[PDB]
Design a protein around this ligand. Structure first.
Ligand SMILES: Nc1ncnc2c1ncn2[C@@H]1O[C@H](COP(=O)(O)OP(=O)(O)O)[C@@H](O)[C@H]1O
Ligand SMILES: Nc1ncnc2c1ncn2[C@@H]1O[C@H](COP(=O)(O)OP(=O)(O)O)[C@@H](O)[C@H]1O
Ligand SMILES: [Mg+2]
Ligand SMILES: [Mg+2]
Lengths: 370, 93, 370
């Protein structure tokens, strides 16, 4: 027995937290730690060397930004502990961690040590009554309400196509690549450098991320738009200066469909989806093609749906209906799924209890997650 | 054409196969007509036996699969602890 | 022709080649085509855009690798042609295709069109005087000085159990499954991904293959070692860094005895062997159980013999003697058998003339074969 479970979808880009049963995640904030890089000289300056959440965004020019997660894998565990502490602070969730079961999310095919260390942190440092490390794609499909389909979740750190049959994620058909929104923004930074506009600072990488979110689109025909004269839309920087983007506007999100633009010999996002579908059973391929669900932030590019549909039709067999679903709540689909799962009474039978972790350890999460 | 095969080493299996064929010929010379007849026998029996062999080749894939699949549609062995502890998971729709 | 014949064993992973009568093939190289993926900028770069043989291994990181054979079936025929001309190149076996008859070795139960196109390629593109196509398992039994017994040939693409009685392989009792060393390397790549080591590159697949070859073993009891936490053994990568392998050492080759670990609807290798033995009349079964000959590279796993013995004993009838023979020359046993067969003057009566192929076609080469 414990309080209402707390859902924490910890992405590489933004963490989304709330209590189970809420319609949307009420507590969303970027997943980075900001530390001041300048010299504090006077009394009355900003307090604390660690800035997380909207306090980091308000003073963004003052801070060096560090991302703990990279490609869905926690690289700095002290920063991850700080961020999860902030999730429980008086600014977010206003509650003690010793009272609420947690439903953490983890991207598929992650390292085992990542899940083990996450459970160790959540059971030792935060002393949670219970824990359940879920997978993002199956939760997104639960949020959509369907039971069978393919979830092509493309987040900040990792993109992956996961087919689910009657609620069970087929584990031998999961396709994953590490090219995601952060890679697209790094590519955009490189192209802006090739256009004369140079950004170095970790705080200016957030300006590059904003440029990606604001003025970038996917052209239906890359070669046709490539040869034509560009329009050079102008973007207003935070300081008031302007920059003319031009060809970098559409070649930056092209990285999702062509990783070879950065020398990676990995599949494209359309190839990820189609190979996940074609690696599954021959009986399920028709219903998997007829049920494709987009998710994550990187699926919000202008013209993403039409471009992916064209690519999948190019790769898919003929006489097979293709229906890519792009719900409005793509950013919070996986969190809404975690909230739906945690509301059920069956979730009581799913979590690893605190005593179970105390007596077993990593094996408890290893059997219970799978 | 009828084939009947029984095999019962530590088990039991009974194949019973039947085929009906209809063809036409032209009667000009008895030796020529007999040779044409035997050629028709050759073609019919060869195609029938090759069809039986092909039907055996596609047994596990399609014919047998209508009764029981080699693996589930998920292509993984059932996690009995999962199905016992957790419900089917199709409560939402 | 009085000139010496050449035996070519074109396996999926490694292609053995050599003049007949030698006790060993001296010209074995990997069976893939490497093409450079980086852009050449200098005057004096590596000439040529096709890299086969030890040169492809020297410049491995510079190249993208492509395998022409998959599961013993030639998928890319142009690359196969390129490799077969490389067999005659000055680097290895400096000779002419017109001067030497060819003993090609091929996997059993292959499609008709594969043998047809192999004969067409060897007779038209190569002006070969005489071609004979054989099997891989019957030769492997010829190598070990026997004429009755069952050969469990487990190569890179395909693994088959073939019972031979008095030289003539029983075509009806052949058992074949497509999971082989290549599938084990892919499974090891997935597991290494699950330890926090990504090897998505095509050239890093060869490093994963090397890790499979040098650090892997088969546990005697599957669940016993699965539950027990294994010591982390460290392997040195080519760049000089180190990777802790851990449970993936023993989970990877277990695919051979449990194809369902990757969702393949097929029988295990022990089941394949026992079914091959039991598909024959009982009077020969007691002799076949005694005369079991391992063959192919994938049988070289540390502890393969013990686990195969345990599984065959678990499946086979009780009170039946079972003896597994593991020759030291397992990789080259098929080529040794091909050399032995070619050394016989009866081989002079077993090949197909160019006039014979021109007159009859595939009918001649298929009535000459078994
Ligand atoms: N409207 C948009 N257009 C393009 N990219 C976006 C948009 N909104 C968010 N993103 C990108 O999506 C990423 C966040 O996606 P999200 O689903 O939160 O990932 P995660 O699963 O890691 O939480 C950010 O890196 C951001 O760059
Ligand atoms: N010591 C070893 N342990 C495990 N696998 C090995 C070992 N040596 C070779 N192999 C594997 O065996 C395969 C080569 O076997 P081989 O008999 O040459 O196959 P083929 O007949 O298809 O050429 C390679 O893919 C390699 O990974
Ligand atoms: Mg997410
Ligand atoms: Mg072989």
């Amino acid at each position: 027995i414990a309080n209402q479970p707390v859902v924490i979808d910890n992405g590489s880009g933004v963490i989304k937290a709330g209590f189970a049963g809420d319609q949307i995640p009420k507590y969303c904030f970027p997943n980075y730690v900001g530390r001041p890089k300048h010299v504090r000289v006077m009394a009355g300056a900003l307090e604390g060397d660690i800035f997380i959440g909207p306090k980091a965004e308000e003073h963004r020019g003052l801070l060096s930004i560090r991302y703990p997660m990279e490609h869905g894998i926690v690289k700095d565990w002290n920063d991850m502990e700080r961020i999860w502490q902030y999730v429980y602070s008086k600014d977010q969730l206003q509650t003690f961690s010793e009272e609420h079961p947690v439903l953490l999310t983890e991207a598929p095919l992650n390292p085992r040590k990542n899940r083990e260390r996450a459970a160790e942190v959540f059971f030792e440092t935060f002393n949670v009554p219970a824990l359940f490390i879920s997978m993002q794609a199956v939760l997104s499909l639960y949020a959509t309400g369907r039971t069978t389909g393919v979830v092509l979740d493309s987040g900040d750190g990792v993109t992956h196509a996961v087919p689910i049959y009657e609620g069970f994620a087929m584990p031998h058909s999961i396709m994953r690549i590490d090219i995601a929104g952060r890679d697209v923004s790094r590519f955009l930074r490189l192209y802006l450098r090739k256009e004369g506009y140079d950004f170095h600072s970790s705080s200016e990488f957030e300006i590059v991320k904003a440029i990606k979110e604001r003025a970038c689109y996917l052209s239906i025909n890359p070669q046709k738009d490539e040869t034509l004269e560009t329009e050079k839309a102008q973007y207003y920087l935070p300081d008031g200066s302007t920059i003319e983007i031009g060809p970098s506007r559409f070649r930056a999100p092209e990285l999702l469909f062509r990783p070879d633009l950065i020398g990676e010999e990995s599949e494209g996002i359309h190839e990820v989806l189609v190979f996940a579908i074609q690696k599954s059973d021959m009986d399920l391929r028709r219903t998997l093609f007829s049920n494709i669900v987009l998710s994550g932030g990187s699926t919000l590019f202008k013209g993403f749906g039409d471009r992916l549909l064209s690519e999948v039709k190019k790769l898919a067999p003929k006489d097979v209906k293709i229906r890519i679903s792009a719900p409005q709540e793509r950013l919070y689909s996986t969190w809404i799924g975690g909230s739906i799962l945690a509301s059920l009474d069956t979730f009581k039978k799913m979590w690893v209890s605190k005593k179970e972790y105390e007596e077993d350890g990593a094996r408890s999460i290893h059997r219970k997650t799978f | 054409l009828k084939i009947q095969v029984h095999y019962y080493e530590d088990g039991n299996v009974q194949l019973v196969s039947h085929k009906d064929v209809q063809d036409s010929v032209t009667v000009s010379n008895e030796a020529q007509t007999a040779k044409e007849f035997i050629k028709i026998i050759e073609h019919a029996e060869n195609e029938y036996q090759t069809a039986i062999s092909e039907n055996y080749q596609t047994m596990s894939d399609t014919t047998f699969k209508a009764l029981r699949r080699q693996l589930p549609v998920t292509r993984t062995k059932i996690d009995w602890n999962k199905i016992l502890s957790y419900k089917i998971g199709k409560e939402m729709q």
